[PDB]
Design a protein around this ligand. Structure first.
Ligand SMILES: CCCCCCCC/C=C\CCCCCCCC(=O)O[C@@H](COC(=O)CCCCCCCCCCCCCCC)COP(=O)([O-])OCC[N+](C)(C)C
Ligand SMILES: CCCCCCCC/C=C\CCCCCCCC(=O)O[C@@H](COC(=O)CCCCCCCCCCCCCCC)COP(=O)([O-])OCC[N+](C)(C)C
Ligand SMILES: CCCCCCCCCCCCCCCCCCCC(=O)O[C@H](COC(=O)CCCCCCCCCCCCCC)COP(=O)(O)OCCN
Ligand SMILES: CCCCCCCCCCCCCCCCCCCC(=O)O[C@H](COC(=O)CCCCCCCCCCCCCC)COP(=O)(O)OCCN
Ligand SMILES: CCCC/C=C/CCCCCCCC(=O)OC[C@H](CO)OC(=O)CCCCCCC/C=C\CCCCC
Ligand SMILES: CCCC/C=C/CCCCCCCC(=O)OC[C@H](CO)OC(=O)CCCCCCC/C=C\CCCCC
Ligand SMILES: CCCC/C=C/CCCCCCCC(=O)OC[C@H](CO)OC(=O)CCCCCCC/C=C\CCCCC
Ligand SMILES: CC(C)CCC[C@@H](C)[C@H]1CC[C@H]2[C@@H]3CC=C4C[C@@H](OC(=O)CCC(=O)O)CC[C@]4(C)[C@H]3CC[C@]12C
Ligand SMILES: CC(C)CCC[C@@H](C)[C@H]1CC[C@H]2[C@@H]3CC=C4C[C@@H](OC(=O)CCC(=O)O)CC[C@]4(C)[C@H]3CC[C@]12C
Ligand SMILES: Nc1nc2ccc(OC(F)(F)F)cc2s1
Ligand SMILES: Nc1nc2ccc(OC(F)(F)F)cc2s1
Ligand SMILES: [Ca+2]
Ligand SMILES: [Ca+2]
Ligand SMILES: [Zn+2]
Ligand SMILES: [Zn+2]
Ligand SMILES: [Zn+2]
Lengths: 665, 102, 43, 665, 153
């Protein structure tokens, strides 16, 4: 048998205290009033006694929404400490107004009435508290190093972290931002950004800061959703602290705000400046119009160069037209690259190369102009710039090596006897790599398309899982390469001994697969695709044990890399894709908005190679914001209106009515 | 709500007729240029009203054919209207389900 | 006539399905309080 | 503008009829009574008038659970047609008892009060109706061909199908089976089986019959769940209309009933007859005990043969011991098969073959004994028997060909010059195929294991999707084989012309890949695994267009079969596996129960090759069933107890109370 | 790590299939075993430039069936010097059935299992990781083992 008792004993209530608490719970006003009046004379009942759950009479009255018994207890001067917090958490308006006019706790000591009200996100109570003079402490910098912060962190890390989280929960309240905020949209943007930064910094409590940031983002999107006319939307998006506020939203990665339907509709009307009815057109009509504009891109560029003020001069400044012209220019560049492959050491550039050169110069000039104008952080935040930098550097190296070979060689020697590191060979290799990168650069244009955009977003996301798997794969590969090279480096053979004077795995009969570490890495790589034959694990000597051990290392590597690792990669990608699919549209619309806005600026109008040849505004914004806040508050109250405590309140009301009727009769 | 809809249709009430999906009259382009948000909202509200299963149950000679053609038109609008695509899709699906339930 | 029968049946079925929120509890509290005030005034 | 009017007009209510219906809705008893009394004298209000929703006064009273107004309307003789159906569907006890003591409809004409009550599955109302003399029509056979069935089907298929579904919904009611059923468990078993058969037959309404069958299965499982002692469970499982009822449940594929925890616990206690504490033992102890019993299987078999009544004679009749002995016997058979491969035309059988022969004879004798004892349908329902039949036939063919080669050949001729269809070669090929099948037969033992059982169930399920994909793959394969053979059959070359006198794709240099249809099918098969080289699409003639077209056919086949079809197969399997995973345990426990019960019988005790050398019972069952039904009814009522109409009823009660108080005051 | 359990579970069924087909192929082909001298380069087995004797012995048969999983076993190893076209066809059919099972059926079933298991684990991945990292951190809280090798000796 297990004896069961009370390990942590407490002070039990008396019979009368239990009867009085039961009367308070049942809502019988008459008996509670009689007990309160008798306690003043006889002092037999402690009006501040708790219950087995820790609640006092005032807490019971608050929990039952019994304003009459609550006020009766307040008129008899019961202990009221922290009762305001329970009233605020219960989200009962009568209790807060009753207590505002005047031990164990469920609330941490740093919780204040206004902070708790902001946590509940209850507009009525928050407004009641902000009607007075209340303040919320300002959190320090995310990476602050002042004496107070480090002292509080060292004295009590848990308390300090809890207090910071409570403050940020209060500040991120949509109702508290609706009131007491000059610019709710900008406040939500910057607060969400700061919460995301805190989530990055705070390894723990990461989920809570992430959800607070998401809540701020949704509040900004919902404020934008309350706009009822295009005039209001234009006023909001163009406000300066054009499309200034839209650019600010893009800076803070407010994807839901940017992808809002009305914002996208306005952006689309700006995108198709020339064509008023592009929305309602057939596929063939759109394709023919695009082909015509693309084929006429050089004419539009020349017209802009000569006279910008004409039917053709300013026709290229339209964003969709500019995008078409730039795309057509790049397509012609790629076509010339393809044509460029249809004994002189350092030959002069051909006609195709002479035509290619201005495009390369234009690419370099455009990149450096973007660096000079936009800045450094903006330039780096665009990943494509990395590929653009690689392409430009490879092209510059190609030109340099071509010049070197032109001014250092004159004779015409057959390529068979050229040096391995001859400048022409290196130049051609670099040019071929640049061609690959240039053709691959077309991926970034998938953003412009409805069917290819979200797919590109998804594949981008899956590249992160692929990179994560790359580390473990490379560790395994290096391990087995070390083992195989250690086993086989004794049997290295000269190229002369080979049947065709060819050494390595790129010969018709593969050999010396594991003789050197570099060759071993290549062999293990090519075995992933099955291009390494099994006889490479064989040696001329009759060392059958060595051959078997090498074959077993090779087989274990195959099993791991193919059966285990590749399938695990499929499972990871399969799962990651499923996660991303829900957000694919929002993510795509954000990326497409960035692409569209990149064509709104005056700079960079000409594609290569042609590029080398306040008070009233605030007032309007304030009135629009006031309307938006009213609409949002009404809508969210309606949504919340449209628990066991409700049934408890219903029972309390019925019992109070019953006791009143019974007493009256 | 069938009761309230019936109460209002007991009187002489009308709902404006939406223009063609690819209409190019002066009124449509004028309203689109003056206020695109208001025009799009009004069109969506009208189609939400018309696609109501209760409003099709009353005030419709052939509820099945009305639901068929209204769902088709809503699907076409969903194709044309790049934004608000989800709302037109769900209105079309609602009309299809109403026909199936009839 | 077949369509009339179908519409009657569909309306009845959908009303039944809908019949089979916080505002409901607010309405219940409102009814109870109105009854309480009427009784208190009468007595 | 769209004019909106009432296309299907109706008869509007008068002002007084609307006021009276509003009074009924609000529950004001006094005004409704006054209106009813005034209608008798002045005839100004139609007491049977509908509302805009079609409800009359009685229907409104029923829907609000207002028994007083309901009884008042009944005392004034209002129209009552189909009101009982609305009362039953509302599941209100007072309304049913009120109406039992005494146009458009929401219920089809075939619905009767008892049928609707069974549909609601409400025990109180069903009991109230069964207290009288009520009957439900008996549905005909699933494949009945009488005159009435075909006449009703041809006259009105919709009405007939609806009536049949309504009848089966009534009969499959757990409450209606709890009452009015001699044996609820057997009734649920056979009714679920019949509903599953109807679901197969009825292509439409398949989902409804499937869910009715599942509901019956769950009712049987829940009745078994109410057992409170091992005596009750034994009485239930052993009842005969041992473990008779468990065998009946297995026959009707009642997987949830068989897999119930207490049933599995009892079966486990029967399974480990010899070892009382096998449940609590270490892995090493269990493994050592299994190895010992398995190594001693011949001793146990001989002991059973000599004296069945001894410590060793009857030790093999225990189910787990018998399973271990049979498994060890099969393992030794496979070990001898492996050993059997460590110039005489038709040689005499070796020592290993002489040892193998009695095992084969034992397998054949055991199969024919199972066929003779169990029956034909039971023999066929076991899929493994198909593989057993194939193994036995291949072994018999092997023995026959060995005999033929022994009695038709005496000389010792080298195998190089033997005929292609020499009896010894065919015998060896058949024996090798039999060895493959025999070793593969061990899959069926995965059921016995906790970790391998559910996995085998899942792979079995995935074999159905693989078979489904097999049809489309074979269609594609046949199509492309026809095309490639048509293109290439002109360039067929003789084997002499080949470099090594080898023709076909199994040569070191593959050739004639598509010369014949049979060879083309094999080539397309082996290209799935990449074993067909690309040069087989080349011909000696300089027909570069023909070669290119053949290479394009081959490439399109590769793209389809590998990129498209194989990935689609992965998606199907991936999805099917996810479906099965939830039911994997129940399915596995059913299969393991079948395996365990197969070792409960006296017949087949000896493994190969040693096999070739009532009123009181019903009363007890009835009392146990009565207790189970009481417990199940109480439990399901509790579960149901633990909608907008509830709030409507609350408002109705409050308003009725308010009107009564106001009238009294 | 979690997916390694599903891989181990699949290992048993794969090994059963592999052993079955190795027994069958070795039984069929062990009559045509040839000496290493008869080979073109005095090399016997599947690790030669021209593969041979793929199924002559059980050990070699197991290795051949293993390497066919990665496609490194050529199809001509199912050919014999004698003109026993029926034997060659039966051996090629055993080899093809093994390929179909192990690659089309078993490998895809393994992908489905891993795919499902990964989805199960993903929810608990963080808690599980933090437990493991806590164990790693606590292993460095003790005085013993402060010096890493070779300074610990
Ligand atoms: C984003 C990429 C930017 C970088 C551009 C790529 C590098 C551009 C720089 C190119 C200069 C390379 C040296 C040229 C010298 C020619 C003569 C010579 O002395 O050869 C010497 C060796 O020469 C080499 O080793 C060249 C190595 C080229 C590596 C390119 C890898 C990057 C490709 C993918 C990127 C030896 O000659 P010797 O001793 O006389 O015999
Ligand atoms: C579940 C499986 C049950 C069936 C068992 C398998 C069949 C058993 C029956 C075997 C009898 C086969 C004929 C033997 C005759 C020998 C001499 C002879 O006349 O050869 C003749 C041809 O012989 C053949 O064509 C044999 C074909 C064997 C097919 C086996 C396929 C099934 C393997 C997987 C299953 C021709 O000889 P000739 O004209 O003198 O030159
Ligand atoms: C010694 C001999 C060597 C011989 C080598 C010969 C072959 C060379 C060919 C190498 C191939 C490189 C492949 C790069 C292709 C990148 C394609 C990614 C496209 C994609 O779906 O994701 C987008 C990637 O954009 C991006 O982030 C930018 C994409 C490119 C970034 C990386 C640049 C690749 C090239 C780097 C140098 C290579 C030199 C070659 C030697 C989305 O992402 P998002 O930008 O919208 O992100 C959002 C906010 N973060
Ligand atoms: C001309 C030359 C030819 C040369 C050929 C050489 C190679 C021959 C080798 C062929 C390989 C056959 C593979 C069969 C393996 C079946 C394994 C299935 C195991 C599995 O997971 O599913 C179980 C299958 O049981 C079952 O349903 C029974 C499994 C076996 C049924 C099919 C029998 C296979 C053999 C048929 C004849 C083959 C002759 C070979 C020429 C579960 O299912 P469950 O029973 O619990 O179901 C429950 C109620 N339905
Ligand atoms: C990330 C860490 C993962 C750890 C996983 C480890 C698994 C290692 C297994 C290495 C398994 C490596 C097996 C292997 O080298 O043969 C080749 C060697 C040399 O020719 O031959 C032998 O080792 C002799 C035995 C041949 C039978 C191989 C048994 C096959 C077992 C599993 C195959 C699985 C295939 C799946 C379809
Ligand atoms: C079930 C029905 C499914 C229908 C699907 C049809 C797709 C058919 C495509 C056939 C695609 C067949 C392409 C093909 O024979 O080359 C080989 C031929 C002959 O040597 O060469 C050529 O045809 C010349 C063009 C070579 C470029 C091939 C372009 C590749 C296009 C797609 C490859 C996809 C690979 C995926 C990673
Ligand atoms: C775990 C148990 C699973 C049981 C599954 C069994 C399936 C066994 C099928 C064996 C299928 C084995 C087919 C096969 O040996 O050819 C090779 C043989 C010998 O060269 O050639 C022939 O058998 C002659 C017929 C060639 C046509 C093959 C038909 C292809 C059928 C299915 C291919 C599926 C590929 C999927 C993309
Ligand atoms: C696919 C193979 C044959 C290579 C062909 C190279 C190019 C000819 C293709 C590859 C990607 C294509 C681009 C993919 C993305 C788009 C977006 C597309 O924009 C739209 O979808 C219209 C709506 C809009 O953007 O306003 C304009 C065509 C374009 C540039 C495509 C132009 C033709 C491109 C460059
Ligand atoms: C796996 C490779 C190396 C082939 C080896 C062949 C056999 C030696 C293996 C293959 C499958 C194994 C069987 C798989 C299933 C079981 C169930 C197992 O039963 C239990 O799990 C104990 C609990 C119980 O069944 O009561 C008894 C061992 C046995 C027969 C195993 C015995 C050993 C077997 C036959
Ligand atoms: N260095 C480079 N900057 C750019 C910007 C746009 C572009 O067109 C494309 F179609 F590739 F996206 C090509 C390039 S290359
Ligand atoms: N023809 C055959 N009937 C049976 C029944 C059980 C058995 O043991 C195994 F371990 F394979 F399941 C083998 C066989 S073979
Ligand atoms: Ca750039
Ligand atoms: Ca059997
Ligand atoms: Zn600080
Ligand atoms: Zn118009
Ligand atoms: Zn009949």
């Amino acid at each position: 048998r297990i004896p069961l008792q009370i390990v942590r004993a407490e002070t039990e209530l008396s019979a009368e205290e239990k009867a009085f608490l039961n009367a308070v719970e049942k809502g019988d006003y008459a008996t509670v009033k009689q007990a309160l009046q008798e306690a003043e004379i006889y002092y037999n009942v402690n009006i501040n006694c708790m219950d087995p759950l820790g609640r006092s009479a005032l807490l019971i009255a608050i929990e039952n929404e019994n304003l009459e018994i609550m006020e009766l207890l307040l008129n008899h001067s019961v202990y009221v400490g922290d009762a305001l917090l329970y009233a605020i958490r219960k989200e009962v308006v009568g209790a807060v107004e009753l207590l505002l006019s005047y031990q164990f706790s469920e609330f941490t000591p740093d919780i204040t009435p206004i902070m708790l009200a902001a946590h509940t996100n209850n507009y009525e109570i928050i407004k009641l508290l902000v009607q007075k003079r209340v303040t919320i402490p300002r959190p320090h910098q995310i990476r602050c190093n002042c004496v107070e912060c480090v002292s509080s962190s060292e004295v009590d890390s848990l308390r300090h972290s809890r207090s910071r989280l409570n403050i940020y929960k209060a500040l991120a309240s949509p109702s508290l931002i609706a009131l007491s905020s000059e610019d709710p949209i900008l406040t939500a943007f910057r607060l969400g950004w700061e919460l995301k930064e805190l989530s990055k910094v705070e390894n723990e409590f990461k989920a809570e800061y992430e959800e607070l940031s998401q809540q701020c983002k949704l509040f900004a999107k919902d404020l934008l959703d309350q706009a009822r006319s295009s005039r209001e939307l234009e006023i909001i998006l163009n406000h300066r602290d054009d499309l200034a506020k839209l650019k600010v939203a893009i800076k803070y990665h407010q994807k839901e705000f940017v992808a809002q339907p009305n914002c996208q509709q306005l952006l689309a009307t700006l995108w198709y400046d020339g064509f008023p009815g592009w929305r309602r057109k057939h596929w063939v009509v759109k394709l023919l119009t695009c082909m015509t504009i693309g084929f006429l891109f050089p004419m539009l560029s020349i017209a802009y160069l000569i006279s910008p003020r004409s039917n053709l001069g300013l026709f290229i400044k339209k964003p969709f037209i500019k995008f078409i012209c730039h795309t057509a220019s790049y397509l012609t560049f790629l076509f010339m690259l393809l044509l460029a492959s249809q004994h002189v050491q350092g030959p002069p550039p051909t006609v195709v190369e002479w035509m290619i050169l201005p495009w390369v110069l234009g690419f370099i000039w455009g990149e450096i102009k973007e660096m000079w104008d936009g800045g450094f952080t903006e330039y780096i935040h665009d990943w494509w710039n990395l590929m653009d930098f690689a392409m430009n550097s490879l092209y510059l190296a190609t030109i340099s090596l071509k010049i070197v070979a032109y001014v250092k060689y004159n004779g015409s020697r057959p390529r068979e006897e050229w040096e391995m590191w001859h400048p022409t060979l290196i130049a051609e290799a670099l040019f071929a790599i640049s061609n690959i990168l240039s053709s691959l650069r077309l991926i970034s244009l998938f953003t412009a398309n409805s069917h290819l955009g979200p797919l590109q977003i998804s594949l981008g996301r899956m590249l992160l899982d692929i990179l994560k798997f790359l580390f473990i794969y490379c560790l395994v590969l290096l391990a087995f390469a070390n083992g195989l090279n250690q086993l086989y480096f004794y049997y290295e053979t000269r190229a002369i001994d080979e049947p065709n004077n060819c050494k390595g795995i790129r010969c018709e009969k593969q050999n010396n697969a594991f003789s050197t570490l570099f060759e071993t890495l290549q062999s293990l790589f090519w075995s992933v695709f099955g291009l390494l034959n099994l006889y490479v694990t064989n040696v001329k000597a009759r060392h059958e044990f060595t051959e078997f051990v090498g074959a077993t290392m090779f087989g274990t590597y195959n099993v791991i890399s193919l059966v285990v690792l590749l399938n695990m990669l499929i499972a990871m990608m399969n799962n990651s894709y499923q996660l991303i699919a829900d957000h694919a549209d929002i993510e795509w619309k954000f990326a497409r908005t960035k692409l569209w806005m990149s064509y709104f600026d005056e700079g960079g109008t000409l594609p290569p190679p042609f590029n080398i040849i306040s008070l009233i505004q605030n007032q309007h914004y304030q009135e629009v914001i006031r309307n938006l806040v009213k609409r949002y508050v009404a809508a969210m109250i309606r949504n919340s209106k449209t628990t066991e405590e409700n049934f408890k309140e219903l029972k309390q009301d019925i019992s109070s009515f019953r006791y009143e009727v019974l007493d009256l009769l």
